[PDB]
Amino acid sequence: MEIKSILIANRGEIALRALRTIKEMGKKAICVYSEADKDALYLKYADASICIGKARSSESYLNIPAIIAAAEIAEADAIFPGYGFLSENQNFVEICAKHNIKFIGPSVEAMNLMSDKSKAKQVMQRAGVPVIPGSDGALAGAEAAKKLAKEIGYPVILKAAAGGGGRGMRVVENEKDLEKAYWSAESEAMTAFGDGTMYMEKYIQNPRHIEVQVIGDSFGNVIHVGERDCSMQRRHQKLIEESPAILLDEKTRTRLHETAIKAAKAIGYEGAGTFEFLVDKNLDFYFIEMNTRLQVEHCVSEMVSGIDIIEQMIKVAEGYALPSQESIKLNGHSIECRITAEDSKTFLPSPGKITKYIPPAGRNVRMESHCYQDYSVPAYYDSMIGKLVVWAEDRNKAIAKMKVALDELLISGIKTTKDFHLSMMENPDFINNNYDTNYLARH
Amino acid sequence: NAMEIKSILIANRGEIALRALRTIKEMGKKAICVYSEADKDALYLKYADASICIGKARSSESYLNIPAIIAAAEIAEADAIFPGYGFLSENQNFVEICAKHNIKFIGPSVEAMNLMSDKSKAKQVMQRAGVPVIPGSDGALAGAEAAKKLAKEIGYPVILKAAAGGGGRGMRVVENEKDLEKAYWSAESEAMTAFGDGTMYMEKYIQNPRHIEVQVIGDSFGNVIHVGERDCSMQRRHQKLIEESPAILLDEKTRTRLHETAIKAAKAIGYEGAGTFEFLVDKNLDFYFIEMNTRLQVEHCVSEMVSGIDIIEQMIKVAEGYALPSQESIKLNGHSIECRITAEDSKTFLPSPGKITKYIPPAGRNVRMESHCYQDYSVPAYYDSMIGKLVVWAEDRNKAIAKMKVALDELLISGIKTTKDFHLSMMENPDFINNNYDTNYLARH
Ligand SMILES: Nc1ncnc2c1ncn2[C@@H]1O[C@H](COP(=O)(O)OP(=O)(O)O)[C@@H](O)[C@H]1O
Numbered sequence: 001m002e003i004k005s006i007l008i009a010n011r012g013e014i015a016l017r018a019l020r021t022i023k024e025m026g027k028k029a030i031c032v033y034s035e036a037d038k039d040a041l042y043l044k045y046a047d048a049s050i051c052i053g054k055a056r057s058s059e060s061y062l063n064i065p066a067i068i069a070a071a072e073i074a075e076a077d078a079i080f081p082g083y084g085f086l087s088e089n090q091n092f093v094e095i096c097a098k099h100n101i102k103f104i105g106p107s108v109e110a111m112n113l114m115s116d117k118s119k120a121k122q123v124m125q126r127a128g129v130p131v132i133p134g135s136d137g138a139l140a141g142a143e144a145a146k147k148l149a150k151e152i153g154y155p156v157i158l159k160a161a162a163g164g165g166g167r168g169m170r171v172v173e174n175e176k177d178l179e180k181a182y183w184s185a186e187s188e189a190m191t192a193f194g195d196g197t198m199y200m201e202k203y204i205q206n207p208r209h210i211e212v213q214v215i216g217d218s219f220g221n222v223i224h225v226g227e228r229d230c231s232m233q234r235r236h237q238k239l240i241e242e243s244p245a246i247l248l249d250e251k252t253r254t255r256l257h258e259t260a261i262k263a264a265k266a267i268g269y270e271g272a273g274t275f276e277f278l279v280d281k282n283l284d285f286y287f288i289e290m291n292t293r294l295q296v297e298h299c300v301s302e303m304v305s306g307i308d309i310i311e312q313m314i315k316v317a318e319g320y321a322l323p324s325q326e327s328i329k330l331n332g333h334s335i336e337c338r339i340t341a342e343d344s345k346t347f348l349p350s351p352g353k354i355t356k357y358i359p360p361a362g363r364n365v366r367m368e369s370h371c372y373q374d375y376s377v378p379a380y381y382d383s384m385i386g387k388l389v390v391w392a393e394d395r396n397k398a399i400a401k402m403k404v405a406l407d408e409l410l411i412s413g414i415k416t417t418k419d420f421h422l423s424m425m426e427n428p429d430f431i432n433n434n435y436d437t438n439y440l441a442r443h
Numbered sequence: 444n445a446m447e448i449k450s451i452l453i454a455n456r457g458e459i460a461l462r463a464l465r466t467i468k469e470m471g472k473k474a475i476c477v478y479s480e481a482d483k484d485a486l487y488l489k490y491a492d493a494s495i496c497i498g499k500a501r502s503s504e505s506y507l508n509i510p511a512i513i514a515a516a517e518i519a520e521a522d523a524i525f526p527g528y529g530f531l532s533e534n535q536n537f538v539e540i541c542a543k544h545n546i547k548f549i550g551p552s553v554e555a556m557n558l559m560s561d562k563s564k565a566k567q568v569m570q571r572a573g574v575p576v577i578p579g580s581d582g583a584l585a586g587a588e589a590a591k592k593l594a595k596e597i598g599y600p601v602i603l604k605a606a607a608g609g610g611g612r613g614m615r616v617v618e619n620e621k622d623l624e625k626a627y628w629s630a631e632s633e634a635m636t637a638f639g640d641g642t643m644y645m646e647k648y649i650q651n652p653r654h655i656e657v658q659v660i661g662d663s664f665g666n667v668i669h670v671g672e673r674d675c676s677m678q679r680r681h682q683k684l685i686e687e688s689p690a691i692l693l694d695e696k697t698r699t700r701l702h703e704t705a706i707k708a709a710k711a712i713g714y715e716g717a718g719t720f721e722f723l724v725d726k727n728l729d730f731y732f733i734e735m736n737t738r739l740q741v742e743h744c745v746s747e748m749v750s751g752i753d754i755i756e757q758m759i760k761v762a763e764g765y766a767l768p769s770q771e772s773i774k775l776n777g778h779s780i781e782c783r784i785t786a787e788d789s790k791t792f793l794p795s796p797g798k799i800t801k802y803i804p805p806a807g808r809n810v811r812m813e814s815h816c817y818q819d820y821s822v823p824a825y826y827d828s829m830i831g832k833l834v835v836w837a838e839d840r841n842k843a844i845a846k847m848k849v850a851l852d853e854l855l856i857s858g859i860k861t862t863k864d865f866h867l868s869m870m871e872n873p874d875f876i877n878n879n880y881d882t883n884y885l886a887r888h
Pocket residue numbers: 132157159163164165166167201202203204205207209233236276278288289437
């Protein structure tokens with residue numbers, strides 16, 4: 001039952017985030033590192049750290065035998081996967097169980113139900129969750145796509161069933177463009193995911209991307225920790241997230257929370273997970289996918305809820321019950337800005353040595369970063385510097401706090417997206433909540 | 444409104460200047476900083492809307508130069524001054540001069556400040572208000588012979604205290620009559636040098652006391668709220684090193700009566716702005732007023748984390764003529780602890796001035812490091828040994844102690860010594876964990 005020692009099978013800011021909660025709980029925190037990451041701050045803080053191989057970027061971190069051997073030599077009885085890397089690898093999950101190591105996440109069955117995005121939609125339909133009109137599972141091929149697109153009506157979006165990170169999608173405005181887009185997406189999908197299965201849905205114009213954080217336990221209870229608006233996106237990837245999503249009235253908010261809970265219970269979900277929805281102009285909402293793991297932006301939900309999500313993940317893995325939904329109080333407003341080592345206009349990576357680093361601080365300011373003065377950022381591989389998160393009593397106060405915090409973040413030696421975020425905090429469209437997932441594309 | 448403040452000069456330095464600046468700017472007001480030449484390297488000067496050099500340095504001397512401070516406010520067109528703590532924050536002449544120059548002093552009236560400033564007269568004011576005080580002299584002692592007579596009357600041990608006293612200075616505990624005359628003159632001389640006023644008073648010396656204080660804020664309508672109580676009993680030289688809220692020593696009935704007493708006291712003196720009533724609590728859990736600080740205190744962040752209130756924000760609103768939130772709206776939750784990290788040796792507490800060659804502060808959920816330091820900053824430990832205040836909050840005391848240890852562990856400072864290891868040994872000290880200590884604990888150990 002009780003977990004005594006947890007190996008963090010990840011790197012960067014999430015490794016440090018996890019380590020803090022693990023050590024506060026009085027458990028051993030075991031870190032792993034490629035040779036390229038021997039300079040990582042969290043290694044100084046870990047109970048033990050194991051070098052798991054050569055840099056080659058993610059390679060060693062994806063080396064299942066090395067991760068397992070590290071857990072075993074360090075005597076870890078559980079593994080925290082974070083996000084990315086092995087967190088959605090079903091093979092890894094089964095191998096953990098084979099070695100009597102607790103995987104802190106959902107069952108391989110639940111993960112498998114939601115891993116093919118086209119099949120996941122069919123599971124959601126069965127469960128009474130609204131989905132976007134489109135293909136019934138995967139497209140057979142380009143001719144099937146042509147027939148269907150005419151039936152649902154343009155514009156449509158082709159999406160990779162094995163897709164993630166915003167890749168393998170193509171919005172198609174007219175039939176003349178369809179076949180070319182199909183093969184473009186299919187090829188990218190094959191290269192990125194080793195699987196070129198495609199599906200299709202209606203393209204919602206100017207949608208809001210609003211997601212519900214859930215956690216389920218071994219007793220079948222599932223709670224939500226509010227919803228997040230992540231509509232400020234470039235290249236279908238998030239830059240700024242916030243909670244609550246003030247776009248929603250309380251009734252729609254309630255319906256959305258309920259839908260997420262219902263969905264989690266229908267699939268026997270345990271652990272932290274997120275249901276992602278698109279919300280249209282008349283506040284209709286549609287499931288687009290579930291992430292069966294923690295997400296990068298989770299801290300915004302922690303700030304409004306008072307919950308340590310990683311603590312609850314660990315407790316659930318130990319067989320404890322979650323708190324009751326009634327005990328969960330959502331208050332105020334949280335915003336997160338992802339600070340990356342990239343130019344604030346071009347968003348091109350800016351690798352190099354940080355020669356000055358002064359993070360912001362203050363009341364209800366949480367800078368989540370593994371960076372420090374003199375640290376070298378490998379922006380070509382991980383451009384993440386840190387997540388700057390604030391909380392305040394309402395959205396306007398949160399924006400003002402973010403502006404001060406961004407102003408006080410002093411980084412020299414590399415370019416960062418600090419100025420991008422500062423310009424967003426002053427942008428009347430952001431202030432008035434008049435934007436959507438395509439806002440940056442047309443500005 | 445007509446009283447809305449647009450620009451605030453921060454008449455202070457160090458960590459409190461940065462703390463104030465953050466709130467002022469978040470409220471959309473201009474933050475004007477001042478600095479002596481020795482403080483040209485201060486971090487908050489980078490963040491200020493404007494920064495004025497007010498003098499060579501001496502130490503506090505330029506910061507204590509009223510004409511220089513007023514002139515800086517006027518050149519910068521500040522309409523209000525935030526005094527922080529120390530320096531001019533309890534200087535009644537400065538408060539009156541602000542009013543003469545049509546600059547709003549963010550703090551109480553000079554009348555309320557004057558009622559409390561002489562600690563012996565303050566006790567008489569409190570008695571009249573129905574607030575319990577420690578038995579002792581009725582106002583100031585006439586001299587050493589009066590002290591001898593009184594000490595037999597109230598009973599040994601007694602403590603001689605400077606009426607103008609502060610910062611733990613000008614006090615002597617007297618356990619027997621043979622020691623009294625010498626102690627009297629030692630305190631009186633120290634008080635004369637430190638405060639320019641050797642007026643002494645006496646009260647009973649409470650055995651093994653706990654120091655528990657109540658944060659209040661009053662507005663111009665006569666409303667006064669409290670923001671909970673803080674236990675600050677882990678002291679060296681009668682000065683605080685660790686503070687927390689709530690004070691788990693107290694049961695609910697006593698805590699309620701303590702909060703009420705502070706509100707009653709503040710209303711009786713017409714107090715507006717932030718202030719703190721300091722009490723000692725004895726072995727029977729009876730509490731007694733010892734003094735009021737008519738200003739913000741160093742450890743205010745402790746009360747912010749349990750209450751969700753920005754105290755400096757409320758001070759500013761009150762100064763603009765707004766009403767405070769209702770007491771009903773103030774919810775006190777969880778437990779917060781603050782450790783004062785200074786540039787001193789953890790064992791000897793001797794200053795360790797010098798350049799910080801590495802600085803990595805802790806962070807994380809509900810961890811607040813209040814510091815103006817940065818890598819390459821030189822700490823003048825001889826003058827201000829403060830590095831920063833590390834504050835954490837959690838759902839209960841043991842969880843807060845666990846979070847404090849993790850945060851202290853992750854604080855990396857090189858180039859100077861700090862009291863980090865002292866605080867780590869306090870978080871691991873079973874007497875601390877078990878709540879079995881008092882203001883003299885460190886002296887016995
Ligand atoms: N049907 C759709 N209509 C409009 N935009 C969409 C649609 N599906 C996805 N998107 C855009 O792509 C983003 C991510 O989609 P998702 O299906 O979650 O992809 P991934 O698995 O790569 O994260 C959404 O936030 C939205 O910006």
